[PDB]
Structure formats: C-alpha cells, structure tokens
Ligand binder design. Structure first.
Ligand SMILES: c1cnc2ncccc2c1
Length: 165
C-alpha cells in the first residue's frame, strides 16, 4: 500500500514523490490526472502520466473527447488507469496561466469525494499557475475521502508541510 506519507489531517496525506513512480509502485485503484478540458496530456502531471502509459492514455482520451466533447473546468471523467492504476480520474482544475477562474478549484476537488481512496497531485499547481499552498488548503477543506498527495518538487513539498495550518 501507500508508504512514507506524512499525515496532514484525518484523511489527507502527503509525500515528496513522482506520481508516476508512486503509481507504478502502489498501482492504486485511482490515480488522479491534472487534466485540461480537451484531455490533451502534453505537459506537467498529464504529460508524465501519459508518457508512462506509452501514449495509451492519450489514445483513449481522444476517443473519449470524440464521443463526449470537452470536460468542464472543475469537472472530471473516469477512464482506464492503464499500467498505473485501475482507473484514472481526469480532473480539470482551473489553469490560472490560461486565465481560468481560481474559484473553480473547490469544484475540481469535489470530484475526489466520489472515490474512497486516491493517489493525486495538487490540483491547479505547477504549470496550471495556482498557489500550491492555496491548493492544499482547498484540498484538505473539500476532500472527505482518503487522498494521498504526491508533490514532485522537494522544495515545494518542504514549503507545503512547514506552512500547513
Ligand atoms: C515526471 C515529469 N514531470 C512531472 N511533472 C509533474 C509531476 C510529476 C512528473 C514526473
């Protein structure tokens, strides 16, 4: 199971780890992807998860978009987890760098409540442009299910833990 996670709250845990490597090791029921509305997994967590699936995640995502159209910012869809997890929950947090509404971050985290346990990144953090300290705060105040956060950056991980209220 999940190991080496620091407990933040009753249900939120955090570790300095590459979510791809965490996924290959744990093979959780659900890995969360930091998706965009088009499921175009180019960079950040999405690009890394997709590259780990040998592009099978992108092929599956393009078929999903061809059938269903784009997701909403704050929305999600459940697709295969391929070699990483049983399922991948593609969650669209607002991309501040693309001018999207930061108020949608709480709606994005509400998607996690449909799954008992998840391996996840901090939504809207990294190349999405939001303040990761704010994202962790919204996570612990929104998610009620068991969330194991993987923070790739060591220096950001230290900053998140040492500043956690
Ligand atoms: C490999 C490469 N880029 C990453 N970016 C964000 C999170 C995890 C990653 C792993």
């Amino acid at each position: 199971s999940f190991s080496g996670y620091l407990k933040l709250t009753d249900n939120v845990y955090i570790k300095n780890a590459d979510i791809v490597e965490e996924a290959k090791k744990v093979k959780p029921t659900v890995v969360v992807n930091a998706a965009n509305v088009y499921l175009k997994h180019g960079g950040g967590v999405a690009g890394a998860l997709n590259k780990a699936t040998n592009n099978a995640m992108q092929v599956e995502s393009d078929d999903y978009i061809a059938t269903n159209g784009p997701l909403k910012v704050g929305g999600s869809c459940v697709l295969s987890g391929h070699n990483l997890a049983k399922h991948c929950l593609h969650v669209v947090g607002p991309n501040v760098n693309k001018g999207e509404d930061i108020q949608l971050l709480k709606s994005a985290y509400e998607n996690f409540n449909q799954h008992e346990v998840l391996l996840a990144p901090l939504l809207s953090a990294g190349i999405f442009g939001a303040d990761p300290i704010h994202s962790l705060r919204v996570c612990v105040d929104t998610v009620r299910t068991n969330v194991y956060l993987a923070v790739f950056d060591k220096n950001l991980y230290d900053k998140l833990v040492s500043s956690f209220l």
